[PDB]
From a paper:
Retaining α-glucosidases employ a conserved two-step Koshland double displacement mechanism, in which α-glucosidase substrates are hydrolyzed using two key carboxylic acid residues functioning as the catalytic nucleophile (Asp518 in GAA and Asp412 in CjAgd31B, a bacterial homologue of GAA) and catalytic acid/base (Asp616 in GAA and Asp480 in CjAgd31B). Mutations in the gene encoding for GAA can lead to enzyme deficiency which generates multiple phenotypic forms of the lysosomal storage disorder (LSD) Pompe disease (PD). Herein, we report a 1,6-epi-cyclophellitol cyclosulfamidate as a new class of reversible α-glucosidase inhibitors that displays enzyme inhibitory activity by virtue of its conformational mimicry of the substrate when bound in the Michaelis complex.
Crystallographic studies with the proteolytically digested form of human recombinant rhGAA (Myozyme)21 and the bacterial GH31 α-glucosidase/transglucosidase CjAgd31B homologue from Cellvibrio japonicus(30) further demonstrated the binding motifs of cyclosulfamidates 4 and 6. Similar assays with CjAgd31B using a Sypro Orange dye revealed that α-glc-cyclosulfamidate 4 stabilizes the bacterial analogue in vitro as well with a ΔTmmax of 5.2 °C and an EC50 of 134 μM. In conclusion, 1,6-epi-cyclophellitol cyclosulfamidate 4 is a selective reversible α-glucosidase ligand that binds through 4C1 conformational Michaelis complex mimicry.
Numbering used by the authors: 35 to 137, 141 to 817
Write the structure that this text describes.
């Protein structure tokens, strides 16, 4: 039984008093509101908000039974008696409190009938998590396959078919009930922590995600090398083995940007060395020479690190002396049993912990380490009586990884202000993307079910802020012999998801260079394709940094008024133009692709398909996976390089997918030096735009470049433009008003500037794209 008593306005923030206490309402933007219950009392700070202490001017109007607090898009309607807040985008009801807040911490809201609810971060439950209840407690799920209620990286957040996102801004051991217990109730619980939620509205899924990333954090553009080929396993045992792997990528002609060193870099055994955080010199005798030798070949070194310092490690005594470890209530260092041994957890919430850990990262980065892998940040084992500077284990648990990322991100920016940190981690919180967190889906089984779950996991994490969510390609856990077909399908899918990092337990090779001739002959041209496609992928990365638009988009983005599409987890968009359907079972001979209505081309074969709603049936082969290109797409390629350190766009090849059904189409290619963290803010980039205008008698391309450029930017790019499904009735090309004849023979066999291949329905234009505007006009 709860009721309104009065309200003030203080710094654009509404402070409401009920019978039970104070509620602080602050607009973080015009479409996002923070609702802090128990506002009177000392709580943990926000973790989800990029700017916790922000509140923009809202308007307040007062009636007899209700207040109205509006930002411009988002309206909080406060019913006085009984006390209940609901949320409106204009006059459309998004979300209404039931009993709202109670006591342990509890929040209760109504679900509308037919409302579909994405969220919870990593679960394998189905895209619509409505009818599910699960804990908010980051925890390992070793060897998962086709089902999980609880994994490495949960998020206390949901996305509704009503186009809101709700964040439970609380770090503690908790739970989410998505109308499981009570078919029309959503309930958020925690054992402790902050009594706060955040509602975000949008007019569309893309503007919802832009609004969400606006207030929770935009991922800084990663270094372009994060889009490259990683050599990884658990684990290279020696410097000799690591050098032999880099050498194997060279001799097998696979692209390689980065080699990842697992826990053998700091000890000879899995158990008992964790916390050493320094080279095992018996097995890595000349690590500085090793990293420098790799850097000469354009190869970066990434080292694993973990929160745990074992009592058996060389750094136990020094960590205890520095007060770097979390304490028991008696005030000693807390020691407990991990799989790896007996040890403590570095307290990243403490000054002493942060400074001690930071110092070690700084020392190893100076030796040549380019990037960082932070594993076990759930934290994997976190006994409930462990004490951090700001709270107990159960209170801070789901933010440990978040703060570890912040600490490491701030540290890397202070050491290398002109470089973009690479931080790969297993667990974080809402907003962790603002610290450049790159998550992976942990210890997936080497099974088809493990592969078949990855699109679901990726989309659930992408939708709520994590564009660079990826899997251990080929699978991680157990198996005794390679499942070749599964491995091949997994590394094909890998080309079309965020981070190309095969990784697995080393009794079976994870790296493609160690596979049989057939496997290499399939994957080598696809790993080259990934590099040739860097202008496509890096542009999707740029859009992610700008608007939070994830690199992987769900099928349901294609039709926002068809909620039945929300359940789809077998087909997704890789950037704007590619609809990818991974093969996630053995011997699949054909697939049914629920392609949105319109025109689509086979990415591999150029075949044109039209549909008015009916799915498309494509045959499958071992050498590819089904990929359709949207009519009106501009697909940009550069020549393949071994390493992004050698990346050049001196030579562009752009494939435009023409169809009269798309009278207007736009593309963009974002180019910068691939390394400057300030390139976007300081406009030190080359943004290429392409516009196609397709009428009955003409096809007109407008090309332009904006931005201030960057050092090494080519003034003039040799451009081959390949027009797919081109009309056979084009006679004449104008380039900037100068008329050129279109050749109709020997296109592949002359230095033709415009040539039509009648057999392939491809019109090839070869020209110079310099700094000035270029118009290409084809006419019948
Ligand atoms: O519990 S594990 O076996 N799984 C953890 C990570 O998830 C793996 O990626 C990594 O290779 C392992 C070795 O450092 C870690 O130990
Ligand atoms: O697309 C066209 O305009 C054609 O086919 O001639």
């Amino acid at each position: 039984a709860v009721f309104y008593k009065e309200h003030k306005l203080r710094n654009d923030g509404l402070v409401i008093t009920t019978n039970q206490g104070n509620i602080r309402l602050q607009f973080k933007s015009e479409a996002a509101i923070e609702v802090l219950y128990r506002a009177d009392s000392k709580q943990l700070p926000s973790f989800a908000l990029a700017q916790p202490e922000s509140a923009i001017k809202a308007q307040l109007t007062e009636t007899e039974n209700h207040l109205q607090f509006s930002g411009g898009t988002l309206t909080a309607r406060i019913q006085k008696r009984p006390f209940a807040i609901s949320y409106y985008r204009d006059s459309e009801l998004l979300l209404a409190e039931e009993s709202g807040f109670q006591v342990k911490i509890n929040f209760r809201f109504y679900l509308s009938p037919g409302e579909k609810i994405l969220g919870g971060g990593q679960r394998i439950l189905g895209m619509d998590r409505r009818g599910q209840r699960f804990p908010l407690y980051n925890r390992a799920h070793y060897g998962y396959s086709d089902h999980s209620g609880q994994m490495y990286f949960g998020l206390p957040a949901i996305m509704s078919s009503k186009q809101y996102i709700l964040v439970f801004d609380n770090s503690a051991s908790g739970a989410m009930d998505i109308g499981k217990t009570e078919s029309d109730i959503l309930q958020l619980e925690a054992k402790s922590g902050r009594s706060a939620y955040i509602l975000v509205a949008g007019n569309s899924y893309p503007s919802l995600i832009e609004n969400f990333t606006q207030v929770t954090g935009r991922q800084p553009l990663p270094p372009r090398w994060a889009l490259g080929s990683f050599a990884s396993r658990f684990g290279y045992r020696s410097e000799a083995e690591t050098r032999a792997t880099v050498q194997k990528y060279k001799t097998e002609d696979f692209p390689l940007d980065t080699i990842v060193l697992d826990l053998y870099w700091f000890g000879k055994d899995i158990k008992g060395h964790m916390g050493n955080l320094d080279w095992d010199k018996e097995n890595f005798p000349t690590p500085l020479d090793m990293m420098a030798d790799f850097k000469q070949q354009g190869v970066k070194t990434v080292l694993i690190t973990e929160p745990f310092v074992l009592t058996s490690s060389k750094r136990w005594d020094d960590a205890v002396k520095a007060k770097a470890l979390a304490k028991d209530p008696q005030g000693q260092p807390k020691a407990f049993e991990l799989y790896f041994g007996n040890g403590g957890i570095i307290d990243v919430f403490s000054k002493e912990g942060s400074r001690w850990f930071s110092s070690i990262y700084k020392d190893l980065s100076k030796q040549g380490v380019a990037g960082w892998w932070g594993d076990l940040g759930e934290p994997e084992m976190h006994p409930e009586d462990t004490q951090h500077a700001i709270g107990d284990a159960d209170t801070v648990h789901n933010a440990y990884g978040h703060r570890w990322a912040e600490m490491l991100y701030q540290q890397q920016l202070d050491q290398f202000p002109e470089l973009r940190p690479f931080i790969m981690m297993r667990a974080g919180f809402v907003g962790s993307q603002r610290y450049g967190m790159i998550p992976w889906t942990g210890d997936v089984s080497r099974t088809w079910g493990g592969l078949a779950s990855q699109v679901e996991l990726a989309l659930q994490m992408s939708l709520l802020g994590f564009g660079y969510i990826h899997s251990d390609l080929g699978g991680f856990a157990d198996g005794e012999t390679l499942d070749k077909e599964m491995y091949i399908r997994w590394l094909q899918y890998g080309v079309f998801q965020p981070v190309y990092r095969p990784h697995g337990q080393d009794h079976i090779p994870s790296e493609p260079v160690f596979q049989d001739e057939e496997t290499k002959a399939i994957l080598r041209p696809l790993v080259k394709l990934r590099y040739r496609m860097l202008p496509y992928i890096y542009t999707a990365a740029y859009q992610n940094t700008l608007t939070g638009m994830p690199l992987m988009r769900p099928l349901f983005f294609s039709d926002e008024k068809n909620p039945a599409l929300i359940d789809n987890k077998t087909s997704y968009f890789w950037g704007d133009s590619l609809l990818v359907t991974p093969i996630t079972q053995a011997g699949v001979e054909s697939v049914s692709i629920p392609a949105p209505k319109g025109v689509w081309f086979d990415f591999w074969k150029d075949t044109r398909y039209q549909t008015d709603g009916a799915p498309l049936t494509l045959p499958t082969d071992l050498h590819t996976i089904p990929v359709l290109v949207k009519a009106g797409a501009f697909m940009p390629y550069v020549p393949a390089v071994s390493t992004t350190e050698d990346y050049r766009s001196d030579s562009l090849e752009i494939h435009y997918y023409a169809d009269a059904s798309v009278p207007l189409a736009q593309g963009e290619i974002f180019e910068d030096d691939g390394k400057d963290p300030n390139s976007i803010k300081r406009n030190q980039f080359d943004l290429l735009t392409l516009q196609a205008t397709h009428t009955d008698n003409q096809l007109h391309f407008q090309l332009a470049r904006t931005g201030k450029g960057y050092r090494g930017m080519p003034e003039r790019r040799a451009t081959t433009l390949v027009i797919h499904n081109a009309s056979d009735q084009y006679q004449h090309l104008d380039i900037n008003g100068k008329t050129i004849a279109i050749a109709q023979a020997d296109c592949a066999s002359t230095p033709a500037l415009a040539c039509y291949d009648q057999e392939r329905r491809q019109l090839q234009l070869v020209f110079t794209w310099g700094r000035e505007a270029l118009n290409l006009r084809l006419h019948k």
